[PDB]
Amino acid sequence: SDLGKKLLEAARAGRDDEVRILMANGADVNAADVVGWTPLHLAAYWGHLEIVEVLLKNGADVNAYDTLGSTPLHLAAHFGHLEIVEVLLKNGADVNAKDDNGITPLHLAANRGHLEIVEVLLKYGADVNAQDKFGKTAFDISINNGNEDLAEILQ
């Protein structure tokens, strides 16, 4: 789609006003680039909260996955976008989604030490014993990283 590509670009660039116009004209909210990222992926990666909300109001797939199994919740949790994590979960994001590596949003939040996001994820039922392809849990990550605060939250 022509407008699908302009929406991918506007969602990445945080151009709220342009996304508004594009939603009116019916730009494909399920458009995806060569790596499988939707506008929701891009808005979650770059932290554009308002655009994440507009996209979800316009029928975007909250649990879309890229060619390696990663969802917008993975990206928002990994890069510390707390408000986006909450919005995604309120709109049905899979809190225990596993990418091709077995890595969950909790793994990624723990790895970067995003304590608030870890608690939001756990509040929404994140599986604290989930293991990735190497057998590691969010707790293993906190011990290896030496994050004592995080290790106490993961009991």
Partner: protein, 1034 residues
């Protein structure tokens, strides 16, 4: 001095002869080039890191080198880019006047001492340090027409059999190969490697062992056993030389005894060193040579020598190989010289005709015909002495000086003719009296013109270098003109002119000349009558003068300013930019469409399209390309419709339809050594370790704000590349250690297969060339291919990459920029219509002051150049105005009479501005220098009117009005003679529409219009100036 040489005509001839011989010698020795060196000296450091991403390059190469660029003299600034093709370029730009050799050796020496700090792979590739220059003399293309050779085949042939002989050709300063010589390519197969429990590590180890030079020693070497009868070198292992030998490299001997050879796990071929560029010439595989002219060389002789050498090579070319010349400046340069020599000859003919029309004897017509060539020849001698070249700028400088030179000849001879006709004196006595009337003014004129033009040589930077070419050329010609007017032409007048009877003004002649003389004598009385009436009512004309001044200023402010006019140089470019992540094959499809358009819809104008996939000035990569369009000769492209600007406009609109690609055509700048030099060049700087993402955010903030001022800023855009998706793979150290797999085997296996690895060198038909291992294409295309690569653990088991790695998509930069050692982002833009670049720069600085903490900025390139040149202009104008006034004050022994001359300035300028505006030209360098020569010649006209009038008042006691009327009466004929000759002489430049007509138009239009109004207005306004000024100051 005139009286000295009037009595010594042989001495005067001797001086003329010496001048002509020096000039003849200079014409033979003088370098010839399209343009001289203009840009400040720049040195570029270039390095390659095969398989490296932009951040790896930046953080292991670029930062290290930058941190060592200390203790170098005369550095203005430093800039760099590190990109995802594994390349870094660092450019150090030095003050104008810096010795470029010293700058480069100082850079090279600091680099040498940083080499131990760089990665081994980069030390192996090496790091080149070169003087930067965008000026090519020509580009020789090499193509294969019978489809028997790839571009790699062609590049190797050029490297092995052409490049060196071209580099040795007379006048060639540098030769750059568009491609590489062959490399031995080992294309690995992961399935076969795993079948035999081998990895790229084993391949590399075997190649290094079995393709090597091994030192041995000597038989009977010293110290020997006495009685030894023979001494001979021992030759041991030497480098391999063929694909056959590489395939037989032994990798493993199996238990059953069977042998695993390199050809059992890899395809082996001679290929290119890299595959990022695909070059096509009208759809056919191509390579080529970019040739630069050597310092002091003759561009015309060098091009001829290059062609002669290529002819000698022709009998040895393989079948299908053809030479093409998609870019060659020397045809243009040859036309320029021809056109300029034409202008000077025609100018001398026109003076001959005007001299005969008015003076009606051939003996007088011969005196300028001698004097003007002598002056021009002497000017070449001075040019040589100053170390200048014959180039576009110096040549047009002499054209712009023609009026001044022609005028010195007309003025000297015409005045003697008048004196003879008005007093009946013999030629010798007449020349003595005539020179006594004008010699002081000629000297004052020389000083005044020097005050006008010399300060123009003291602008700094690139614009100053351009202005200096015109300044030295014009001042030199003007200075020789006055010397010749004081030495030679008086001697020629006294010895060559025939007497004229007192009162004889030719009115008694018959036929055309008798009628002409009566007509002109009557017209002179009509002229002096009009000036009488003008002088009876001066206040009205002072009002009209202020009107002219206001109209000048108004027309000046509205006249768009540029540097040098675009030219139909027979070539232009087409940018092809596809979305991020677009692959090479996709770019190739677009380039094919582009090539197909020019060869179909523009087949009567286009000779060739040189399509280069993978190269882009804004950044390299698979998603970018250029199409260099070479046109047929101007003689086959008649009319504006078939010129670059029209072709370009048509192409750009035609390509607007292309989907998922930005494709547009544009003309080249006049001076390719410089960029467009239009707009501004801004650097956003990370001053506090903010990092790439925060800098991008700050950039976007600035770009968005700039977009809110379309009235002031236009096309404010980043010059670099946007972040793109990249494949992040994490190796799990614990899992690697648990399985007994070393990290070095993992990273070598990954890098060698997917990025490629330069192993060592081999010798191909007597030439040393590189050996590269890399995965065959089909095993390194997609993430699923990662898991097909196995690494052998310590216990012998083969372990797939999937077992000890994980991956995810992320964004990163394909091109990281730095400025003076700090992260940066370059931003280009231009002032909106009607606004000055200075005003646009002011706003940019205001917007930049509101960016987040830690973000700074700087001006670079043209913008750095414009700020410094602008800071000098006020003081250079002041010095010119002050010195002009002082010279006139000394000439006239008066603090006030100078004003009557200096008031002439607007009279020429108004007509130059009118002609430029009407014709739709710009306030460019040729227009500006022409304004100075028009002002100069009008000031000369006024100087002689005022001189005559003042001398009549001082010596003959005549009244103010009486002397003014007698002065303008006497000066009418010579003023009209020069103006008629000079205006007709520049006419061909105005109407020219051929090659180089952009510069010819810019020289002629302003000069012709300025000469028209300067002539018409000055003969009426100068008497007003003198009368009004004398009345005010008694």
């Amino acid at each position: 001095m005139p009286n000295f040489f009037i009595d010594r005509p042989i001495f005067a001839w001797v001086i003329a002869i010496i001048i002509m011989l020096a000039g003849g010698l200079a014409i033979l020795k003088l370098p010839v080039a399209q343009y001289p060196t203009i840009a400040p000296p720049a040195v570029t450091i270039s390095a390659s890191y095969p398989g490296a991403d932009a951040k790896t390059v930046q953080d292991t190469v670029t930062q290290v080198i930058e941190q060592n660029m200390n203790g170098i003299d005369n550095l203005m600034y430093m800039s760099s880019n590190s990109d995802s093709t594994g390349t870094v370029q660092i450019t150090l730009t030095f003050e104008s006047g810096t010795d470029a050799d010293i700058a480069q050796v100082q850079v090279q020496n600091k680099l040498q001492l940083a080499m131990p700090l760089l990665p081994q792979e980069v030390q192996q590739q090496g790091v080149s340090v070169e003087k930067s220059s965008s000026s090519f003399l020509m580009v020789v293309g090499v193509i294969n027409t019978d489809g028997t050779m790839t571009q790699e085949d062609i590049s190797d042939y050029v490297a092995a059999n052409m490049k060196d002989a071209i580099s040795r050709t007379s006048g060639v300063g540098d030769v750059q190969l568009f491609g590489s010589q062959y490399a031995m390519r080992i294309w690995m197969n992961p399935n076969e490697l795993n079948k035999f429990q081998l990895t790229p590590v084993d391949v590399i180890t075997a190649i290094k062992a079995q393709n090597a030079q091994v030192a041995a020693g000597q038989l009977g070497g010293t110290p020997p056993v006495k009685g030894q009868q023979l001494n001979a070198s021992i030759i041991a292992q030497t480098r391999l030389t063929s694909t056959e030998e590489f395939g037989k490299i032994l990798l493993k001997v199996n238990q059953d005894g069977s042998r695993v050879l390199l050809r059992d796990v890899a395809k082996i071929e001679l290929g290119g060193e890299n595959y990022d560029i695909i070059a096509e010439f009208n759809g056919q595989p191509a390579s080529g040579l970019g040739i630069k002219l050597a310092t002091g060389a003759n561009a015309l002789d060098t091009a001829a020598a290059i062609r002669a050498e290529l002819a000698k090579m022709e009998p040895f070319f393989p079948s299908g190989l053809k030479i093409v010349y998609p870019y060659d400046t020397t045809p243009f340069v040859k036309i320029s010289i021809h056109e300029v020599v034409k202008t000077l000859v025609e100018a001398i003919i026109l003076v001959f005709l005007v001299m005969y029309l008015f003076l009606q004897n051939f003996r007088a017509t011969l005196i300028p015909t001698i004097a003007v060539p002598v002056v021009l020849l002497g000017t070449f001698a001075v040019l040589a002495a100053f170390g200048f070249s014959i180039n576009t700028l110096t040549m047009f400088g002499m054209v712009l000086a023609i009026g001044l030179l022609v005028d010195d000849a007309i003025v000297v001879v015409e005045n003697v003719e008048r004196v003879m006709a008005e007093e009946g004196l013999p030629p010798k006595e007449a020349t003595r009296k005539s020179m006594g009337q004008i010699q002081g003014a000629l000297v004052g004129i020389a000083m005044v013109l020097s005050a006008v033009f010399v300060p123009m040589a003291f602008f700094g930077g690139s614009t100053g270098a351009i202005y200096r070419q015109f300044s030295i050329t014009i001042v030199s010609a003007m200075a020789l003109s006055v010397l010749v007017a004081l030495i030679l032409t008086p001697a020629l007048c006294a010895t060559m002119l025939k007497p004229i009877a007192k009162g004889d003004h030719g009115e008694g002649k018959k036929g055309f000349f008798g009628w002409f003389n009566r007509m002109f004598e009557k017209s002179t009385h009509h002229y002096t009558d009009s000036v009488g009436g003008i002088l009876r009512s001066t206040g009205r004309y002072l009002v009209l003068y202020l009107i002219i001044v206001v109209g000048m200023a108004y027309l000046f402010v509205r006249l768009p300013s540029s540097f040098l006019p675009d030219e139909d140089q027979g070539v232009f470019m087409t940018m092809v930019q596809l979305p991020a992540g677009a692959t090479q094959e996709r770019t190739q499809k677009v380039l094919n469409e582009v090539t197909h358009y020019y060869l179909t819809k523009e087949k009567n104008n286009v000779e060739s399209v040189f399509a280069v996939n993978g190269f882009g000035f804004a950044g390299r990569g698979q998603n970018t390309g250029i199409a260099f369009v070479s046109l047929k000769d101007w003689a086959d492209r008649p009319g504006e419709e078939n010129k670059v600007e029209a072709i370009t406009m048509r192409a750009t609109r035609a390509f607007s339809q292309i989907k998922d690609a930005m494709v547009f055509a544009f003309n080249l700048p006049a001076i390719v050594e410089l960029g467009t030099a239009t707009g501004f060049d801004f650097e956003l700087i990370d001053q506090a370790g903010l990092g790439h993402e925060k800098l991008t955010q700050a950039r976007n903030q600035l770009l968005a704000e700039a977009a809110k001022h379309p009235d002031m800023l236009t096309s404010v855009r980043p010059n670099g590349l946007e972040d793109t998706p990249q494949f992040k793979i994490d190796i799990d150290q614990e899992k690697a250690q648990a399985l007994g797999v070393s990290i070095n085997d993992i990273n070598t296996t990954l890098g060698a297969a997917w990025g490629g690895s330069y192993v060592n060198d081999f010798i191909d038909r007597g030439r040393v060339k590189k050996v590269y291992v890399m995965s065959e294409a089909k095993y390194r295309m997609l993430p699923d291919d990662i898991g097909d690569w196995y690494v052998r653990a310590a216990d012998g088991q083969m372990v797939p990459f999937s077992a000890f790695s994980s991956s995810r998509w992320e964004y990163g930069s394909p091109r990281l920029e730095r400025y003076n050692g700090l992260p940066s982002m370059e931003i280009l833009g231009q002032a909106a219509p009607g606004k000055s670049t200075g005003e646009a720069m002011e706003l940019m600085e205001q917007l930049a002051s509101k960016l987040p903490t830690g973000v700074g900025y700087d001006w670079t390139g043209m913008s750095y150049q414009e700020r410094l040149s602008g800071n000098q202009a006020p003081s250079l104008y002041a010095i010119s105005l002050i010195v002009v006034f002082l010279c006139l004050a000394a000439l006239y022994e008066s603090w006030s009479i100078p004003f009557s001359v200096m008031l002439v300035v607007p009279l020429g300028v108004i007509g130059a501005l009118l002609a430029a505006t009407f014709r739709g030209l710009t306030n460019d360098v040729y227009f500006q220098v022409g304004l100075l020569t028009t002002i100069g010649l009008s000031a000369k006209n006024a100087i002689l009117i005022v001189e005559f009038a003042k001398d009549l008042m001082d010596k003959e006691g005549k009244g103010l009005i009486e002397a003014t009327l007698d002065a303008v009466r006497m000066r009418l004929r010579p003023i009209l003679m020069t103006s008629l000759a000079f205006i007709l002489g520049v006419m061909p430049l105005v109407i020219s529409t051929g090659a180089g007509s952009g510069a010819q138009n810019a020289v002629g239009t302003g000069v012709m219009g300025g000469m028209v109004t300067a002539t018409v207005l000055a003969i009426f306004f100068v008497p007003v100036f003198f009368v009004v000024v004398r009345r005010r100051f008694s």
